[PDB]
Design an enzyme around this catalytic site. Structure first.
Site, PDB file in Angstrom:
ATOM      1  N   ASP B 340      54.049 -16.069 -53.449  1.00 38.43           N
ATOM      2  CA  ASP B 340      53.182 -16.732 -52.598  1.00 38.43           C
ATOM      3  C   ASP B 340      51.891 -16.169 -52.377  1.00 38.43           C
ATOM      4  O   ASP B 340      51.670 -14.947 -52.693  1.00 38.43           O
ATOM      5  CB  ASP B 340      53.827 -17.017 -51.334  1.00 38.43           C
ATOM      6  CG  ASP B 340      55.182 -17.687 -51.343  1.00 38.43           C
ATOM      7  OD1 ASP B 340      55.848 -17.543 -52.105  1.00 38.43           O
ATOM      8  OD2 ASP B 340      55.713 -18.382 -50.283  1.00 38.43           O
ATOM      9  N   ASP B 685      62.535 -21.588 -46.915  1.00 33.86           N
ATOM     10  CA  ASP B 685      62.854 -20.636 -48.288  1.00 33.86           C
ATOM     11  C   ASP B 685      64.077 -20.458 -48.694  1.00 33.86           C
ATOM     12  O   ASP B 685      64.424 -20.353 -49.840  1.00 33.86           O
ATOM     13  CB  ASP B 685      61.797 -19.516 -48.342  1.00 33.86           C
ATOM     14  CG  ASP B 685      60.439 -19.727 -48.272  1.00 33.86           C
ATOM     15  OD1 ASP B 685      59.948 -20.730 -49.238  1.00 33.86           O
ATOM     16  OD2 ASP B 685      59.795 -19.417 -47.273  1.00 33.86           O
TER      17      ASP B 685
END
Ligand SMILES: *[C@@H]1O[C@H](CO[C@@H]2O[C@@H](C)[C@@H](O)[C@@H](O)[C@@H]2O)[C@@H](O[C@@H]2O[C@H](CO)[C@@H](O[C@@H]3O[C@H](CO[C@H]4O[C@H](CO)[C@@H](O)[C@H](O)[C@@H]4O)[C@@H](O)[C@H](O[C@H]4O[C@H](CO)[C@@H](O)[C@H](O)[C@@H]4O)[C@@H]3O)[C@H](O)[C@H]2NC(C)=O)[C@H](O)[C@H]1NC(C)=O
Ligand SMILES: *[C@@H]1O[C@H](CO[C@@H]2O[C@@H](C)[C@@H](O)[C@@H](O)[C@@H]2O)[C@@H](O[C@@H]2O[C@H](CO)[C@@H](O[C@@H]3O[C@H](CO)[C@@H](O)[C@H](O[C@H]4O[C@H](CO)[C@@H](O)[C@H](O)[C@@H]4O)[C@@H]3O)[C@H](O)[C@H]2NC(C)=O)[C@H](O)[C@H]1NC(C)=O
Ligand SMILES: CCCCCCCC/C=C\CCCCCCCC(=O)OC[C@H](COP(=O)(O)OCC[N+](C)(C)C)OC(=O)CCCCCCC/C=C\CCCCCCCC
Ligand SMILES: CCCCCCCC/C=C\CCCCCCCC(=O)OC[C@H](COP(=O)(O)OCC[N+](C)(C)C)OC(=O)CCCCCCC/C=C\CCCCCCCC
Ligand SMILES: CCCCCCCC/C=C\CCCCCCCC(=O)OC[C@H](COP(=O)(O)OCC[N+](C)(C)C)OC(=O)CCCCCCC/C=C\CCCCCCCC
Ligand SMILES: CCCCCCCC/C=C\CCCCCCCC(=O)OC[C@H](COP(=O)(O)OCC[N+](C)(C)C)OC(=O)CCCCCCC/C=C\CCCCCCCC
Ligand SMILES: CCCCCCCC/C=C\CCCCCCCC(=O)OC[C@H](COP(=O)(O)OCC[N+](C)(C)C)OC(=O)CCCCCCC/C=C\CCCCCCCC
Ligand SMILES: CCCCCCCC/C=C\CCCCCCCC(=O)OC[C@H](COP(=O)(O)OCC[N+](C)(C)C)OC(=O)CCCCCCC/C=C\CCCCCCCC
Ligand SMILES: CCCCCCCC/C=C\CCCCCCCC(=O)OC[C@H](COP(=O)(O)OCC[N+](C)(C)C)OC(=O)CCCCCCC/C=C\CCCCCCCC
Ligand SMILES: *[C@@H]1O[C@H](CO)[C@@H](O[C@@H]2O[C@H](CO)[C@@H](O)[C@H](O)[C@H]2NC(C)=O)[C@H](O)[C@H]1NC(C)=O
Ligand SMILES: CC(C)CCC[C@@H](C)[C@H]1CC[C@H]2[C@@H]3CC=C4C[C@@H](O)CC[C@]4(C)[C@H]3CC[C@]12C
Ligand SMILES: CC(C)CCC[C@@H](C)[C@H]1CC[C@H]2[C@@H]3CC=C4C[C@@H](O)CC[C@]4(C)[C@H]3CC[C@]12C
Ligand SMILES: CC(C)CCC[C@@H](C)[C@H]1CC[C@H]2[C@@H]3CC=C4C[C@@H](O)CC[C@]4(C)[C@H]3CC[C@]12C
Ligand SMILES: [Mg+2]
Ligand SMILES: [Mg+2]
EC number: 7.2.2.13
Lengths: 40, 987, 294
Positions: B340, B685
């Site tokens: 990320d 996630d």
């Protein structure tokens, strides 16, 4: 080589063992020193 | 269902009276300590533990120690039979039994030592980062260890938090908990303080232990703590983990099996050979024991558990906490990293860099000075801009901050909101007064659906319509939302030209790699909205559009220091990095270009279209190595399209991709046949974290759900730590191979004397007592020394291994151990043997065939080469002086083998002698060999005799030769990549 | 797998590799195992150089000397029936094998067998251990010297009527001079009578005190009629410098042996450079189990 040739059949194993032990001890010491060197 | 009696029926007053806790304040710390001491820590009684004596005992009667036990027993019984027969027998069988039993004792204590070591190290990973709980005490909210939670304490839980203990919900706002572990259904159930049902499994106001809050927030009181909880009863007895092994351990086991089968067949066959050739029943089992011990590498399982445990401690030292042991092995094989942008690559410390208002680009934020700003603080539009920046902002400063400057202080809120606060206080003034004057009637926090923030404020001044609406958000979306722009105090309708200039400003600031936020406000007419008029948040009454765009505010966020080097190492390593972020493609593209994801020279389809001045659709998609996929496009794409982008592109960056889409990306990466690791902090996630090969959860900010869902935890939330961890992961394989390569080499010198004994008909050069001393007695420590080894320069410069093609034990390994190195340790021992017999009177030509006569106790007349006549014990003594010499020639050659084994690519001069355990092993073995040869009594008990000094040196030419040979083969590999040497010899 | 890993026809592979790989590996291993063989042969040749042809470098493992015997008894037991002839055949075949080397036909001419004193004498030094004066000369030892156990009169040597013989022999050692005990007040009981300095005495007895009575008359046959070895047959110069050399022998007849009972007889040589060992039961002495079951 004459009657008194007794030496041709003798070996000083005693002295050999003494030296071999002194050496073994020395090697063992060196070993331990290296192993603990850093931890003191 | 059976054990259920709860407090849900009690009202707030009843609950307060029974528990005795201030519902608003929570219990005091003093009461918390008293309750903790009385009730005990909030933890579940641990299970009992195997006793120390039982384990040790398992070691005594485990591994192959059983074979040695049977052999020792057989020797004792044989001696007992000899006792009955003629008097004054030879205590040879008695001392043989005494030797085997000792071997079992030493092996049991050593293996026990190693196993305990690993278990204790694994336990250390239990109290490093504990599991916490947010409690309310003395009115203040504090974070405390989970064990410290007491009954009656006011606990607060939010989305992603674990429930510390059974609670009674006092207050909640859209709280959804998942009772999958309790009931089994994964559907989240709402939780409310209202009393819905009489039964505990259905009541809305009870949170059970081990559950997790999926969304919302709630406050409850601890009804049960520790084992008293409902889930605690089941979890203590019912949920115990079973023992589990790895794939590294099972490849090694399979191999142990194949070698064991060949060894047992050879043994039994030699046994029958001895009987056909006239030996004693006891000597047949003796030969079998020697052959089995010399051929079966018993140390491999211990060496694998030790390698994995030691490497894990190195990781935990370098910020990589592995939840399970399998992850340590999987990390080395990592092929793709989906990371990320915010939290991992960067630091998440935003600072307000530039602004755009009055249709101009303005610099600001003096470097902690009083210089103010580059422009006039007097600007009319600037007033409205700072007004919306301070009023719409949610973050506030904490207490005790008055002593230091604004750039250095702490804040509470989002990074962007904090940056805005630091900027307004440095240039504008005080936010406390501004927020105070324009009271906020209602506020709408940032929502995914809205994608904007909102705040309604009342204006105390005159000339205004008494209503001021302020909102911020994405600049593209807010510009769509506004009809007018404020320029130098005069408002003007928003035309296309103004929008073009605005887009230019956005492109300019975004290209810089800064996050731009749009800002706007509107003064709603007084006639339509009176002073009294209430604005409904639930049903929007006020106009959302036709607002006035004030300007844009942009902030900076530098990347981590270690990140660029990490991406570089990955590129050199052959690992693919993907960036999945919520930001805009311009900012993504940029950040990515700067960090190293998109190296120089690589261009996307849009980049080539821009250079060529051709439409993007016309450009060939294969022409671009890297690409930035939009989230909307990712949703619209099919499995084949996803595979097309993943196969055809070297550098992929997914921008504006929701964290939920990560699962599709992970699946696509796996379809290819790559081992992927994915980073995750939130709840959405979790599916991707479970699906990915290596789930990396953020340690600092990750929630309990994500932590539970992942295998590895990043303590620093840095990306470089991941690369360092993979570096450690490859060292496990390198060291394991160097260990298998070592232990197996001694097989050829230990077994060849028996084969030569039978085929050649010469006297036995090496006995069984010595064989046990070699494998079981001295090499135990040197085998382990191979795990402490460091890495080689090339560890990060090679490709990832694939489990389908690579295996630990391959044909090339057997080429180096058996064929080339082994045959040499065999010649060195045979040479020392020939020398002892030749010096004492037996020459070499005369030795072929003397066995039949040699082993015959009855021939006291054996004639040597010089014609002398030898008795039975006199001749046997020279044979034993050969077993001892062989032994020593083996330790001496072992020196060259152990030294060459250290590295496989580089020389030992480059690598160096910095491993202390290895050196300690060379000295200790040499010392043991000298000791066993020289100590008195060994002659009778161990059958070893003193060695004269000219003999120790017979193995020296074969040791120097082994060393020189391996050095040259390493050289030719480094010089000629992909050559015949590397194809055949590289294991 | 099973079939495909054996022979595929697309990659033209056999057992796993192609023709040029198998050829490069085979050529490498042949050259390698050749350097290895040549080095071992060289390091062994230097070893052959190091040593001498007329004398073993180390002579400490064989001293003092052992005491072997004919016949060849397994477990040191001589058991045979006086009726069944196929019971003492394995014994006679050995006894005969040993005495077959002292045939007069073998000992003939001046070399390399010279006539020596018919009565025990002193040592004889034929120089040093060199090749200067060629092959040395050894004293002749006649068969007939052993009177009732020679296989010349009663081929069987005694086993035929319950009276066996045992030819004892001293282990041949290079440069070993036998030294008998002197006439001083300290000497075993047995040795006092017939103290021929030049004879190394051999005397058998019973292991246990009980068996004494059950053992009859030990009649020793030897050079000069004494129960020993004449010092004139020493020292031994080794095979290379003394081929065709005969070591003295001593015959022992165990007359008047009790029938149907295991008798443990221990024979022992005496002398200065003679020492026994509690571990080696053949160093200087020897044990025999005799049982003439009939
Ligand atoms: C060392 O000397 C050995 C004995 O020498 C004999 O006595 C000395 C003093 C001289 O007089 C010498 O001239 C004598 O020969 C010598 O061994 C002898 O070798 C001969 C030749 O083979 C043997 O003669 C054969 O005897 C067998 C039967 O033997 C029986 O007795 C012996 C024990 O003596 C047992 O072991 C056997 O199992 C038998 O029970 C005959 O069957 C055989 O017949 C052959 O000859 C006849 C003619 O006579 C032919 O018609 C036949 O076809 C055969 O060809 C022989 O007569 C003699 O047995 C053997 N003696 C002993 C004790 O074994 C030895 O070889 C010499 N060694 C060296 C290295 O010089
Ligand atoms: C090895 O040793 C023995 C014994 O020697 C004696 O003992 C030693 C430990 C040491 O003290 C010696 O000094 C000591 O002599 C030798 O054999 C001995 O020889 C003498 C002499 O012939 C014998 O003595 C005789 O004893 C008879 C009765 O037992 C007696 O009748 C004899 O009379 C003879 O001598 C007298 C004078 O004394 C004379 O008048 C007579 O006319 C007659 O000649 C005589 O006293 C011993 O018994 C012998 N010992 C044994 C055990 O038999 C032996 O000769 C010697 N060998 C060698 C090669 O040197
Ligand atoms: C952490 C490290 C600490 C290290 C500190 C070390 C401190 C120093 C201690 C010892 C140093 C050396 C001592 C030297 C004495 C050795 C004894 C010795 O020389 O004895 C020899 C004689 C044997 O008789 P022989 O040769 O005549 O037989 C005939 C031989 N044939 C059959 C071939 C004819 O002894 C006998 O008779 C009587 C024997 C009596 C008992 C001797 C004990 C020997 C056993 C152990 C002591 C050595 C320990 C070394 C530690 C090394 C660590 C690995
Ligand atoms: C790491 C694992 C690798 C290798 C493991 C091997 C496992 C083997 C385990 C145990 C083996 C035990 C062997 C016992 C030692 C001898 C005991 C014994 O049965 O002896 C009997 C002999 C008697 O012989 P005899 O009367 O027939 O001799 C007649 C001599 N004539 C006639 C020539 C004069 O006794 C004597 O000679 C007296 C001499 C006594 C010897 C003292 C030596 C002490 C032995 C061990 C202690 C060393 C431990 C290491 C500590 C390290 C510290 C750092
Ligand atoms: C009348 C009858 C006459 C008969 C005469 C026969 C004479 C035979 C002469 C020489 C025998 C040679 C034996 C060597 C066997 C090597 C086997 C081997 O290389 O298999 C490696 C395998 C797989 O390897 P990879 O992945 O590279 O396959 C790559 C496959 N590709 C690349 C083609 C796709 O691995 C595995 O199966 C797993 C590991 C297996 C380990 C085997 C080690 C052997 C263990 C103990 C035996 C030691 C005895 C030593 C004494 C010998 C007597 C002198
Ligand atoms: C199963 C796996 C086994 C692995 C290794 C096994 C090691 C076995 C090595 C030797 C064992 C065999 C026994 C050797 C005895 C043979 C004796 C011999 O040979 O007597 C020939 C010559 C002696 O001549 P002289 O001076 O006495 O004649 C003087 C002539 N006048 C004076 C009249 C001029 O001896 C010589 O020349 C030198 C001969 C010495 C030894 C040579 C043995 C063959 C050569 C190399 C063997 C190593 C092969 C390595 C292969 C690796 C893959 C397995
Ligand atoms: C008569 C003929 C006999 C033939 C017999 C053959 C025997 C075996 C043959 C060879 C084996 C010995 C070879 C020793 C190799 C020494 C290499 C050396 O010296 O490489 C210098 C190194 C490099 O330094 P650097 O800073 O550039 O590395 C930078 C590393 N980077 C880049 C990762 C940061 O320096 C270092 O490793 C730091 C200093 C380490 C010093 C090590 C000294 C100990 C060596 C052996 C111990 C003895 C074991 C035997 C025990 C038995 C005794 C009785
Ligand atoms: C006549 C019989 C007795 C002879 C005794 C000789 C003793 C010699 C004593 C020391 C040796 C010299 C020191 C070597 C230092 C080298 C330093 C160094 O810079 O090395 C780097 C090179 C490897 O560079 P690279 O692969 O990265 O290049 C890559 C090139 N590209 C990129 C094109 C692929 O290293 C290499 O060449 C290492 C290759 C060396 C192989 C020779 C082994 C020498 C044999 C024994 C040494 C003595 C140790 C044991 C002592 C026993 C005492 C009793
Ligand atoms: C007591 C113990 C003594 C032990 C002494 C051992 C000494 C023996 C050492 C080496 C002898 C073996 C030489 C074998 C030469 C024939 C091998 C051969 O046919 O190879 C062919 C290849 C050329 O084919 P390519 O790769 O171009 O085709 C590409 C193929 N495709 C298409 C598959 C990619 O050859 C190449 O690559 C070149 C590679 C050549 C191999 C170099 C290995 C050198 C290793 C050691 C020598 C150092 C000895 C030091 C001893 C000091 C003693 C005191
Ligand atoms: C051989 O042993 C026998 C005994 O087996 C001895 O003869 C015995 O002598 C006793 C008198 O002491 C008589 O009572 C027996 O009748 C005799 N038995 C036989 C079979 O004769 C004999 O004296 C011994 N002879 C020798 C030379 O030792
Ligand atoms: C690092 C390397 C090169 C060191 C090699 C050390 C070698 C040479 C050492 C290790 C053990 C040593 C032996 C240990 C014991 C003895 C017994 C003694 O009575 C004579 C010396 C002798 C035989 C030593 C000779 C040298 C020796 C073999
Ligand atoms: C005692 C003597 C005669 C035995 C000689 C055995 C030799 C020929 C054996 C021992 C080890 C064997 C090698 C072991 C492993 C491999 C790897 C494989 O992929 C090809 C065959 C190859 C290279 C073998 C060839 C034959 C070999 C070298
Ligand atoms: C480095 C390597 C390849 C060198 C190997 C050299 C080999 C071929 C050499 C080394 C020592 C040599 C031996 C040395 C001594 C003798 C004795 C002689 O009466 C016959 C030849 C013979 C048996 C030689 C044969 C060749 C030999 C074995
Ligand atoms: Mg998982
Ligand atoms: Mg081994």
């Amino acid at each position: 080589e004459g009657p008194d040739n007794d030496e041709r059949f003798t070996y000083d194993y005693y002295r050999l063992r003494v030296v071999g032990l002194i050496v073994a001890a020395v090697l063992c010491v060196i070993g331990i020193i290296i192993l603990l060197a850093g931890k003191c | 269902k059976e054990v259920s009696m709860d407090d849900h029926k009690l009202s707030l007053d009843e609950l307060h009276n029974k528990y005795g806790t201030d519902l608003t304040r929570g219990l005091t710390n003093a009461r918390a300590k008293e309750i903790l001491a009385r009730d005990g820590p909030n933890s579940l009684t641990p299970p009992p533990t195997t006793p120390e004596w039982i384990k040790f005992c398992r070691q005594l009667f485990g591994g192959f120690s059983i074979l040695l036990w049977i052999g020792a027993i057989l020797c004792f019984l044989a001696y007992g039979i000899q006792a009955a027969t003629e008097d004054e027998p030879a205590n040879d069988n008695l001392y043989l039994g005494v030797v085997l039993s000792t071997v079992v004792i030493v092996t049991g204590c050593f293996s026990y030592y190693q196993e305990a070591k690993s278990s204790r190290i694994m336990d250390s990973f239990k109290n490093m980062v504990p599991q916490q709980a947010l409690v309310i005490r003395d009115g203040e909210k504090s974070t405390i260890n989970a064990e410290f939670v007491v009954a009656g304490d006011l606990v607060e839980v939010k989305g992603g938090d674990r429930i510390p203990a059974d609670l009674r919900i006092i207050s909640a706002h859209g709280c959804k908990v998942d009772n999958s572990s309790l009931t089994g259904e994964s559907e989240p159930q709402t939780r409310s303080p209202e009393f819905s049902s009489e039964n505990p499994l259905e009541t809305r106001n009870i949170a059970f232990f081990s559950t997790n809050c999926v969304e919302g927030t709630a406050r409850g009181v601890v009804v049960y703590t520790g084992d008293r909880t409902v889930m605690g009863r089941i979890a203590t007895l019912a949920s115990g983990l079973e023992v589990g092994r790895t794939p590294i351990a099972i490849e090694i086991e399979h191999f142990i099996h194949i070698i064991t089968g060949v060894a047992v067949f050879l043994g039994v066959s030699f046994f029958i050979l001895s009987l056909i050739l006239g030996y004693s029943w006891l000597e047949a089992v003796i030969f079998l024991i020697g052959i089995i011990v010399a051929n079966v590498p018993e140390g491999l399982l211990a060496t694998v558990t030790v390698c994995l445990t030691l490497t894990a401690k190195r990781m935990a030292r370098k910020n990589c906490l592995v939840k399970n042991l399998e992850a340590v092995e999987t990390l080395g094989s990592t092929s793709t990293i989906c990371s990320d942008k915010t939290g991992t690559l960067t630091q998440n410390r935003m600072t307000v860099a530039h602004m755009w208002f009055d249709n101009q680009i303005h610099e600001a934020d003096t470097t902690e000075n009083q210089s103010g700003a580059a422009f006039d603080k007097t600007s009319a539009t600037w007033s409205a801009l700072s007004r919306i920046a301070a009023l719409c902002n949610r973050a506030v400063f904490q207490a005790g901050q008055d002593n230091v400057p604004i750039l250095k202080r702490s804040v509470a809120g989002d990074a962007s909101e904090s940056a805005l606060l630091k900027c307004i206080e440095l240039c504008c003034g005080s936010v406390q007064g501004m927020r105070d004057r324009n009271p906020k009637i209602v506020e709408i926090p940032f929502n995914s659906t809205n994608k904007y923030q909102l705040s309604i404020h009342e204006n105390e001044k005159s000339s205004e319509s008494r209503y001021l609406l302020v909102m911020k958000g994405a600049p593209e979306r807010i510009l769509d939302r506004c009809s007018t722009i404020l320029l130098n105090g005069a408002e003007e309708p928003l035309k296309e030209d103004m929008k073009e200039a605005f887009q230019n400003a956005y492109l300019e600031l975004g290209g810089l790699g800064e996050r731009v936020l749009g800002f706007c406000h509107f003064a709603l007419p007084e006639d339509k909205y009176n002073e009294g008029y209430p604005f409904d948040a639930d049903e929007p009454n006020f106009p959302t559009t036709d607002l006035c765009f004030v300007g844009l505010m942009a902030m900076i966020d530098p990347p981590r220091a270690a990140v660029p080097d990490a991406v570089g190492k990955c590129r050199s390593a052959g690992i693919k990095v993907i960036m999945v972020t919520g930001d805009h493609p311009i900012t993504a593209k940029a950040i990515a270009k700067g960090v190293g994801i998109i190296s120089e020279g690589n261009e996307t389809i849009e980049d080539i279209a821009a250079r060529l001045n051709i439409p993007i659709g016309q450009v060939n998609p294969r022409d671009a190595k890297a690409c930035v996929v939009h989230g909307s496009d990712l949703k619209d794409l099919s499995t084949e399209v996803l595979d097309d982008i993943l196969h055809y592109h070297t550098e992929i960056v997914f921008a504006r991709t929701s964290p939920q889409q990560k699962l599709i990306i992970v699946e696509g990466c796996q379809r290819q046949g790559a081992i992927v690791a994915v980073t995750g902090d939130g709840v959405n996630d979790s599916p991707a974290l479970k699906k990915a090969d290596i789930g990396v959860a953020m340690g600092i900010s990750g929630s309990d759900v994500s932590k539970q869902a992942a295998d590895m935890i990043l303590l620093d939330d840095n990306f470089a730590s991941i690369v360092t961890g993979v570096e450690e992961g490859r060292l496990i394989f390198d060291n394991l191979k160097k260990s298998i390569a070592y232990t197996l080499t001694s097989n050829i010198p230990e077994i060849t004397p028996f084969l030569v004994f039978i085929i050649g008909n010469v006297p036995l050069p090496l006995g069984t007592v010595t064989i046990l001393c070699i494998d079981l007695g001295t090499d135990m420590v040197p085998a382990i020394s191979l795990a402490y080894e460091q890495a080689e320069s090339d560890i990060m410069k090679r490709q990832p291994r694939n489990p389908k093609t690579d295996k630990l034990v391959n044909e090339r390994l057997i080429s180096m151990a058996y064929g080339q190195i082994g045959m040499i340790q065999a010649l060195g021992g045979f040479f020392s043997y020939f020398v002892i017999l030749a010096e004492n009177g037996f020459l070499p030509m005369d030795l072929i065939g003397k066995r039949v006569r040699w082993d015959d106790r009855w021939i006291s007349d054996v004639e040597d080469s010089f014609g002398q006549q030898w008795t039975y014990e006199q001749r046997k003594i020279v044979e034993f002086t050969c077993h001892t010499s062989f032994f020593i020639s083996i330790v001496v050659v072992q020196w060259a083998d152990l030294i060459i084994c250290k590295t496989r690519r580089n020389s030992i001069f480059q690598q160096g002698m910095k491993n202390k355990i290895l050196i300690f092993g060379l000295f200790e073995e040499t010392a043991l060999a000298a000791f066993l040869s020289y100590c008195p009594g060994t002659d009778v008990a161990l059958r070893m005799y003193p060695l004269k000094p000219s003999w120790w040196f017979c193995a020296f030419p074969y040791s120097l030769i082994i060393f020189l040979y391996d050095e040259m083969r390493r050289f030719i590999i480094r010089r000629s990549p992909g050559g015949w040497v590397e194809q055949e010899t590289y294991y | 797998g099973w079939k495909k890993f054996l022979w595929d026809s697309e990659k033209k592979e056999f057992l796993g590799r192609t023709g040029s790989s198998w050829f490069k590996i085979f050529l490498f291993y042949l050259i390698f195992y050749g350097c290895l063989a040549g080095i071992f042969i060289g390091t062994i040749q230097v070893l052959l150089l190091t040593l001498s042809d007329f004398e073993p470098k180390y002579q400490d493992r064989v001293a003092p000397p052992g005491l072997s015997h004919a016949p060849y008894a397994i477990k040191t037991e001589i058991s045979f029936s006086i009726s069944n002839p196929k019971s003492y055949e394995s014994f006679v075949k050995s006894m005969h094998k040993l005495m077959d080397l002292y045939n007069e036909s073998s000992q003939a001419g001046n070399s390399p067998f010279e006539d020596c004193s018919d009565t025990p004498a002193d040592y004889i030094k034929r120089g040093d251990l060199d090749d200067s004066q060629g092959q040395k000369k050894a004293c002749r030892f006649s068969r007939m010297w052993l009177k009732n156990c020679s296989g010349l009169d009663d081929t069987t040597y005694g086993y035929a009527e319950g009276k066996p013989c045992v030819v004892a022999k001293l282990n041949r050692i290079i440069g070993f001079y036998p030294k008998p005990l002197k006439n001083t007040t300290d000497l075993p009981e047995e040795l006092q009578a017939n103290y021929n300095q030049y004879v190394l005495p051999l005397r058998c007895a019973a292991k246990r005190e009980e068996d004494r009575e059950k053992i009859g008359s030990i009649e020793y046959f030897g050079l000069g009629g004494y129960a020993g070895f004449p010092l004139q047959y020493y020292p031994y110069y080794g095979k290379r410098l003394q081929k065709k050399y005969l070591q003295p022998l001593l015959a022992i007849q165990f007359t008047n042996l009790t029938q149907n009972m295991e008798l443990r007889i221990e024979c022992k040589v005496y002398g200065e450079n003679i020492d026994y060992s509690e571990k080696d039961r053949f160093r200087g002495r020897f044990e025999v189990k005799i049982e003439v079951k009939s």
